[PDB]
A paper describes a structure:
Microbial epoxide hydrolases, cis-epoxysuccinate hydrolases (CESHs), have been utilized for commercial production of enantiomerically pure L(+)- and D(−)-tartaric acids for decades. Studies have shown that both [name][L] and KlCESH[L] adopt a two-step catalytic reaction mechanism by 18O-labeling studies.
Careful analysis of the obtained CESH[L] structures revealed a potential active catalytic triad consisting of D18, H190, and E212, along with the active water molecule in [name][L] while the corresponding possible catalytic triad in KlCESH[L] consists of D48, H221, and E243. In light of this hypothesis, we constructed another inactive mutant, [name][L]-[name], which was expected to halt the catalytic reaction at the second step and create an enzyme-substrate ester intermediate. [name][L]-[name] was cocrystallized with CES and the structure was solved at 2.20 Å. The D18/L-TA, [name], H190, and the active water were all with unambiguous electron densities. The carboxyl substituent on C2 of the substrate is bound by residue T133 and N134 via hydrogen bonds, as well as a water-mediated hydrogen bond networks; while the cap domain’s Y58 and R59, along with N134 and Y192 from the core domain, bound the carboxyl group on C3 via polar interactions. Interestingly, residue R55 forms a hydrogen bond with the C3 hydroxyl group, and the substitution of R55 with Lys leads to a loss of enzyme activity, along with a significant increase in the Km value. This suggests that R55 should play a critical role in positioning the oxygen of the epoxide, as well as provide a proton to the oxirane oxygen atom to form a hydroxyl that facilitates the epoxide ring-opening reaction.
Numbering used by the authors:
A (entry chain B): 3 to 246
B (entry chain A): 11 to 246
Write the structure that this text describes.
């Protein structure tokens, strides 16, 4: 008789990237402060950056509602333009600086666990980014965040953002494997819940610093998702991927 | 100057023939002699090549795995007097196109290019095939692009244009890298730079070498590392 074993029958790990793998907030804060210099203080810039992702999320929630896709870089830029208008009394940015500020969403550094965790996961699973960011943006953050993918997948490829099912199912179709063999890895519950809806596995990566050192992150209960980890290496360990 | 290097993969980066030959023989063992299987593999690529040539002409897209499977199924019937294959082995034999081994230069050459360029696969192989070929050929990509992404094979313009749009890089800033002149000529026609990688063994010894003189394309190289060298990428 063959013992049941402990292997998990996932073929691909689909990764949300922003926040889940990348310290976007620290990048955007540092990027903006570097670009804007003495025109913005950290707290004022931090509040804009926090409002920036909220505007991006609000706009992406709105676009998902109407089944619309647009360039997420344009989403980041348009939301920044709106926020610069509300903070216009405090500081200003040129178009060139707005372009440079938007680029920060494409210069995200990864959390220290991610590059080794992604490589550690390679030994058993395909790792593919499934990001709402434009395909170029994720290709770009892959350089700044040292993300080595088997596949870069974007909402752009599917003409639809996560949580829309076509993103996960399309990613499954592209990867040539059933969604039930996809482990979705996100730091955001919406992403995993939708991936669970299409049958994919759910791995929540706790990112306590995602929204800052004092930022508020959802304390996902144990058992909500198939995996609850604070490190991609930790997820890799729980997936039978030995550390190298 | 280029911002991304767009690579054709089958042949250009991968010794698909030796891959498919050894892969088939590993599956079929002594049912089929090496020479007979080698003939099947050569006709197999031919069926794929001819099918894609036609589908390109008709602006039609099909799963390239289906193209490999269907052509293999027809080839298995044609060769069914010499050997047979179960339905499972047809799948396993067709899997060999997703197990392509790279040429010895490609892993180091791709990595050396990474330091100064985005490197992205643009293959006619289905997205799953190139992703799996990345594992077998040890191809680390910034981006994997399949004809499946665009519903159109190379050399169709929307593949290079689609790759440009996806990479966020103007075609003039994309160096197309291919072992086939058709790929680069069309990429040249979208404004992309052209690097021809000579792969004299890609069709085997009997394979005809499509002659490419110096000056036909921007780069004429015998390896990816040589292309990286000609592109200013420091060695490793």
């Amino acid at each position: 008789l063959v013992p049941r074993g402990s292997h998990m029958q996932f073929r691909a790990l689909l990764f949300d990237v922003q926040g889940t793998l990348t310290d976007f907030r620290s990048t955007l804060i540092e990027h903006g402060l570097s670009i804007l210099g003495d025109r913005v203080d950290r707290e004022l810039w931090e509040e804009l950056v926090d409002q920036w992702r909220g505007c991006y999320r609000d706009e992406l929630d709105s676009l998902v509602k109407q089944e619309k896709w647009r360039s997420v870089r344009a989403v980041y830029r348009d939301s920044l333009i709106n926020l610069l208008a509300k903070f216009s009394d405090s500081f200003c940015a040129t178009s060139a600086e707005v372009e440079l500020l938007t680029d920060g969403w494409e210069r995200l550094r990864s959390w220290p666990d991610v590059p080794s965790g992604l490589e550690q996961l390679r030994s058993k699973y395909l790792v593919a980014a499934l990001t709402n960011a434009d395909f170029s943006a994720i290709v770009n953050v892959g350089r700044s965040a040292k993300l080595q993918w088997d596949a870069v997948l974007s909402a752009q490829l599917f003409g639809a953002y996560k949580p829309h099912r076509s993103t996960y199912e399309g990613a499954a179709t592209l990867l040539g494997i059933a969604p039930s063999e996809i482990l979705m890895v996100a730091s955001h519950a919406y992403d995993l819940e939708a991936a669970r809806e299409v049958g994919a596995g759910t791995a929540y990566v706790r990112r306590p610093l995602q929204y800052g050192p004092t930022g508020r992150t959802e304390d996902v209960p144990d058992g909500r998702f198939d995996f609850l980890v604070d490190s991609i290496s930790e997820l890799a360990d729980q997936l039978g991927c030995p550390r190298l």
